[PDB]
Amino acid sequence: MNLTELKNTPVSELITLGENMGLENLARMRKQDIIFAILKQHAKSGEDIFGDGVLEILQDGFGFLRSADSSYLAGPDDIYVSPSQIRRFNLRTGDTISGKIRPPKEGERYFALLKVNEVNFDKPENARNKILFENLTPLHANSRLRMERGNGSTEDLTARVLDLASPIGRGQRGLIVAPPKAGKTMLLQNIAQSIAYNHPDCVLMVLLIDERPEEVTEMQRLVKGEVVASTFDEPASRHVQVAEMVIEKAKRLVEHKKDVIILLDSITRLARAYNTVVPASGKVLTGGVDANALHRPKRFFGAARNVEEGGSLTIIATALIDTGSKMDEVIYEEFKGTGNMELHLSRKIAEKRVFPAIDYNRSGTRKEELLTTQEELQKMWILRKIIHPMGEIDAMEFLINKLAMTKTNDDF
Amino acid sequence: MNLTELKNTPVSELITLGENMGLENLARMRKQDIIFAILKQHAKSGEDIFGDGVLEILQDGFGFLRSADSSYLAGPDDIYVSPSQIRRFNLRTGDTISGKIRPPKEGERYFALLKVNEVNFDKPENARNKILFENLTPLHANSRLRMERGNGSTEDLTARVLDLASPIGRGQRGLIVAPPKAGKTMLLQNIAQSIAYNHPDCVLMVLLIDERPEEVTEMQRLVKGEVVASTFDEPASRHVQVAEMVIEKAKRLVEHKKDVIILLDSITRLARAYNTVVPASGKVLTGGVDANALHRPKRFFGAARNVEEGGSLTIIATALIDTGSKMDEVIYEEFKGTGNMELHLSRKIAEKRVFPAIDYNRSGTRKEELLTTQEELQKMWILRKIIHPMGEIDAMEFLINKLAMTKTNDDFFEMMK
Ligand SMILES: Nc1ncnc2c1ncn2[C@@H]1O[C@H](COP(=O)(O)OP(=O)(O)OP(=O)(O)O)[C@@H](O)[C@H]1O
Numbered sequence: 090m091n092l093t094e095l096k097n098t099p100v101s102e103l104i105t106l107g108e109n110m111g112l113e114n115l116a117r118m119r120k121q122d123i124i125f126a127i128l129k130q131h132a133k134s135g136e137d138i139f140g141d142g143v144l145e146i147l148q149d150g151f152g153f154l155r156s157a158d159s160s161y162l163a164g165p166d167d168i169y170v171s172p173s174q175i176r177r178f179n180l181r182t183g184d185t186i187s188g189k190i191r192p193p194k195e196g197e198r199y200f201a202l203l204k205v206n207e208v209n210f211d212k213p214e215n216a217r218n219k220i221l222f223e224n225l226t227p228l229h230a231n232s233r234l235r236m237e238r239g240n241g242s243t244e245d246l247t248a249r250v251l252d253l254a255s256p257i258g259r260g261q262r263g264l265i266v267a268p269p270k271a272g273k274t275m276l277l278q279n280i281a282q283s284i285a286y287n288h289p290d291c292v293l294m295v296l297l298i299d300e301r302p303e304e305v306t307e308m309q310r311l312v313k314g315e316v317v318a319s320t321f322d323e324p325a326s327r328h329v330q331v332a333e334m335v336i337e338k339a340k341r342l343v344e345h346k347k348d349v350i351i352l353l354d355s356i357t358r359l360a361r362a363y364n365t366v367v368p369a370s371g372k373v374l375t376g377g378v379d380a381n382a383l384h385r386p387k388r389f390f391g392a393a394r395n396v397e398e399g400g401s402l403t404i405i406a407t408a409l410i411d412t413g414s415k416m417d418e419v420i421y422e423e424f425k426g427t428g429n430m431e432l433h434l435s436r437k438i439a440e441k442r443v444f445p446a447i448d449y450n451r452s453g454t455r456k457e458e459l460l461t462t463q464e465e466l467q468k469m470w471i472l473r474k475i476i477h478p479m480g481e482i483d484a485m486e487f488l489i490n491k492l493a494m495t496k497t498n499d500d501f
Numbered sequence: 502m503n504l505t506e507l508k509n510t511p512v513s514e515l516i517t518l519g520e521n522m523g524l525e526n527l528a529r530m531r532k533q534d535i536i537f538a539i540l541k542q543h544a545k546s547g548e549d550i551f552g553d554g555v556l557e558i559l560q561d562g563f564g565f566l567r568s569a570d571s572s573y574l575a576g577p578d579d580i581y582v583s584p585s586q587i588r589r590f591n592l593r594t595g596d597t598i599s600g601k602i603r604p605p606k607e608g609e610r611y612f613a614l615l616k617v618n619e620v621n622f623d624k625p626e627n628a629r630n631k632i633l634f635e636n637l638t639p640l641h642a643n644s645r646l647r648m649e650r651g652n653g654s655t656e657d658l659t660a661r662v663l664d665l666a667s668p669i670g671r672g673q674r675g676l677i678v679a680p681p682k683a684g685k686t687m688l689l690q691n692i693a694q695s696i697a698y699n700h701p702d703c704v705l706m707v708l709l710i711d712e713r714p715e716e717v718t719e720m721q722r723l724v725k726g727e728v729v730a731s732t733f734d735e736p737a738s739r740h741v742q743v744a745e746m747v748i749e750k751a752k753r754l755v756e757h758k759k760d761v762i763i764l765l766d767s768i769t770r771l772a773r774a775y776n777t778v779v780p781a782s783g784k785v786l787t788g789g790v791d792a793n794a795l796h797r798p799k800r801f802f803g804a805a806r807n808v809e810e811g812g813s814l815t816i817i818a819t820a821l822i823d824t825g826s827k828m829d830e831v832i833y834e835e836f837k838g839t840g841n842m843e844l845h846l847s848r849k850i851a852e853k854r855v856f857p858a859i860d861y862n863r864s865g866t867r868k869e870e871l872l873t874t875q876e877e878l879q880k881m882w883i884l885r886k887i888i889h890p891m892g893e894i895d896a897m898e899f900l901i902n903k904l905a906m907t908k909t910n911d912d913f914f915e916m917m918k
Pocket residue numbers: 247268269270271272273274275276444445867868
């Protein structure tokens with residue numbers, strides 16, 4: 090009886106397994122309520138029930154264990170964490186906890202944790218003690234994330250143009266500037282698919298803020314990583330909670346010297362959600378957004394960095410532009426010189442169905458000298474010197490007609 | 502007899518046919534009171550009286566049966582539902598209930614439910630836990646709702662342009678951006694007429710929020726579906742109640758693998774009613790509207806989706822723009838990237854009496870690849886590539902002057918490449 094195993098099984102199968110235990114009011118209930126009832130009926134059997142989840146501490150000091158399957162949504166199937174446990178184990182908001190859970194007594198309304206088996210995929214040890222705020226921050230350039238999954242596929246074409254224009258490194262702040270209808274939704278999943286095949290050691294998390302539900306289901310069923318999202322029919326507090334949970338889990342995993350990658354969608358809408366949630370403090374609003382509010386999402390984007398001790402924390406967020414709203418324009422202007430990697434998309438190139446729509450002249454990475462080989466800098470700069478006088482769309486033709494012949498593996 | 506039978510009969514017949522039973526002081530009273538009195542006078546005859554209505558459960562735990570004819574308005578002619586009954590039948594706020602009702606007692610003012618005959622057009626067998634919150638959400642491009650009647654009528658012309666510009670699929674989030682005096686009201690009824698004539702299997706519901714009464718009567722007398730409305734002389738709580746009742750009925754009907762379509766008018770007015778009703782707790786507000794309030798209408802628009810299990814839930818809402826109020830501007834800005842289908846109208850094209858006035862260059866549907874045939878995408882792309890360099894006012898001329906010859910099934914036989 091593993092809680093996570095229940096949460097990953099379809100609701101249609103939950104009815105058959107729950108009805109076979111003597112439960113009748115499961116005819117039309119939510120998956121969380123069904124799982125809670127099934128556990129409470131199986132808890133009467135005195136058998137060991139196992140559970141796990143990502144910790145989130147509330148204001149009162151006890152917190153709960155949110156589920157990654159439910160995108161860290163508050164529900165009856167959550168696990169209560171005692172404050173004394175948080176005093177026994179130095180637990181912060183974001184620690185993945187696994188262990189045996191106990192049945193609820195009279196008047197508790199939530200399950201509680203009996204034993205702490207593992208903390209962040211490791212036994213309860215305090216060896217990995219260096220919190221992310223205390224780790225030194227070198228430049229992103231001490232590794233390259235090559236997105237080259239194959240040799241002769243149409244998918245790798247966009248990834249090959251990405252590798253040629255803006256190399257990706259461990260712990261880089263990626264910023265994808267994209268107008269509407271410019272190939273931004275498939276560009277993210279193309280990167281995510283290439284991440285899992287090329288760098289399986291990296292923990293890949295795709296965060297979708299203020300996204301349509303059908304595209305959420307498309308993404309979470311097509312990417313082999315951890316896809317978390319919050320649909321537009323949810324309050325901005327939900328978006329803020331999901332974003333902070335994801336960033337805290339990433340920080341805690343990086344504290345274990347792991348390489349974590351975050352693909353954030355619509356950072357502008359995340360900043361809008363923050364402006365909505367933050368209790369307005371100063372009346373100095375410009376363009377509709379409170380200034381101090383923008384302090385909160387920046388910190389999110391500020392978490393991405395390379396670590397001198399170990400591991401990395403990579404964040405690639407998409408900045409929406411040409412939306413017609415001055416709010417998104419002000420957000421993008423405030424996020425101008427924050428990232429060390431910028432990937433620009435052109436709407437005019439997407440009109441003529443050239444699907445790699447990267448503005449090569451307006452795309453690049455800072456400190457790319459250490460992200461590439463000594464001889465790799467020369468070829469990329471020579472290629473950029475001849476693309477500079479070219480047109481905005483005529484450059485992509487010149488790229489594809491030469492890139493679709495050979496690979497980036499052994500150039501010439 | 503049947504309460505519903507009375508609700509659909511004119512008030513003139515309620516007085517003439519009801520006074521013949523011995524009640525003559527119901528003339529100067531409301532239709533709901535007239536129906537209540539007629540039922541109470543016909544109930545003393547010991548004849549089985551049947552009733553039905555859409556369930557609405559209150560906060561206290563009991564519910565009533567609102568009438569679709571009265572646009573789900575609270576009245577004396579409603580049927581009380583006991584909570585204990587709700588414990589036997591795990592009923593939600595959208596379940597349409599039909600069955601035998603009992604007469605009220607002296608001192609009681611509402612009818613009660615004796616027997617539960619049908620639940621959502623079916624025997625009470627709710628063994629499938631197909632609640633909307635648990636159904637999977639595929640994309641809206643499984644089946645296409647084509648608005649091509651083939652009648653070759655000027656009416657079908659606007660619908661033919663609609664099919665050419667933005668195809669409609671099962672379970673789509675439609676957003677009709679429309680300035681004032683640009684052909685919005687006529688565009689909706691054209692869609693509603695084409696839905697009932699082409700796709701009778703779909704349950705069509707036309708929701709009108711903050712609408713004038715004469716236009717409400719115009720709409721409910723021209724659409725072959727279920728027309729529900731709440732006039733502007735009613736509080737915002739009424740608008741919220743009507744909208745939530747409609748969306749819950751749609752959700753419950755989708756739970757039975759049915760294809761439900763919702764034509765919502767003035768989603769901006771629904772968001773305004775929500776902002777009025779929502780208990781402002783967030784001390785922030787932009788443009789006059791509270792931000793947290795906007796969480797409530799979005800969910801309505803968020804309900805529209807395709808379902809992997811069965812049926813669909815289609816919602817096409819009209820977003821008002823260029824009204825001069827920053828409130829509507831903020832609402833439209835918050836609903837910018839929410840829908841997967843956008844149909845824009847231009848007042849300048851409508852000003853020249855070319856009334857379809859569709860902004861072709863800024864209208865379209867995402868993932869339209871699965872809504873059309875393999876060769877239909879090519880023809881649409883070729884047609885859009887030649888409209889792209891044209892203006893707004895000159896594109897509709899080129900479309901209409903060429904569309905009135907063929908029927909959008911032969912329109913792709915000339916200028917082939
Ligand atoms: N690399 C590609 N290869 C093939 N087809 C693509 C590619 N990129 C985009 N497309 C097609 O073009 C469309 C581009 O839209 P996409 O989903 O990429 O994001 P977008 O439309 O820019 O995002 P938004 O919804 O915010 O406008 C897609 O629907 C897809 O069918």
